[PDB]
Design a protein around this ligand. Structure first.
Ligand SMILES: COc1ccc(CCc2nc3cc(-c4c(C)noc4C)ccc3n2CCN2CCOCC2)cc1
Length: 127
């Protein structure tokens, strides 16, 4: 029940660009969630060994976390804004799959997702 390696965060065989959407995703979306009281469980990959979750990576085959997302944005790993939005959605969905309604972590994820949706509402337009 060991963990997999973390997701890749730096892509040498991909071109890089700054867009207004990617700027918003790091400076507004990621930074607003990262600073939230509830951010710590989501700031690095789930350590299923330390947390005593031996079936986690039997159930979750596309792990994702905000530490990964932050590094991806800082490293220009994403070309399209939708790649980053999908990673946030994957992170929340994984939490909902593994855990149960009423678990503290679920309530925490739901609060962070509401905040995500409030900030994504003001994502700027595509060039
Ligand atoms: C003992 O090993 C660890 C490993 C990581 C961390 C970072 C914080 C933390 N990361 C978490 C991820 C999850 C989680 C997610 C996310 N998805 O499914 C599960 C299940 C749940 C709770 C988490 N928590 C608080 C856990 N509590 C309070 C901290 O000490 C342990 C008990 C802390 C301790």
């Amino acid at each position: 029940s060991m963990n997999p390696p973390p997701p890749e965060t730096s892509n040498p065989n991909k071109p890089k660009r700054q867009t207004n959407q990617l700027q918003y995703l790091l400076r507004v979306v990621l930074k607003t969630l990262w600073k939230h009281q509830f951010a710590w469980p989501f700031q690095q990959p789930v350590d299923a060994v330390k947390l005593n979750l031996p079936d986690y990576y039997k159930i979750i085959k596309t792990p994702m976390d905000m530490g990964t997302i932050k590094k991806r944005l800082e490293n220009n790993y994403y070309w399209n804004a939708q790649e980053c939005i999908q990673d946030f959605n994957t992170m929340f969905t994984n939490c909902y799959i593994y855990n149960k309604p009423g678990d503290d972590i679920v309530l925490m994820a739901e609060a962070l997702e509401k905040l995500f949706l409030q900030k994504i509402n003001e994502l700027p337009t595509e060039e």
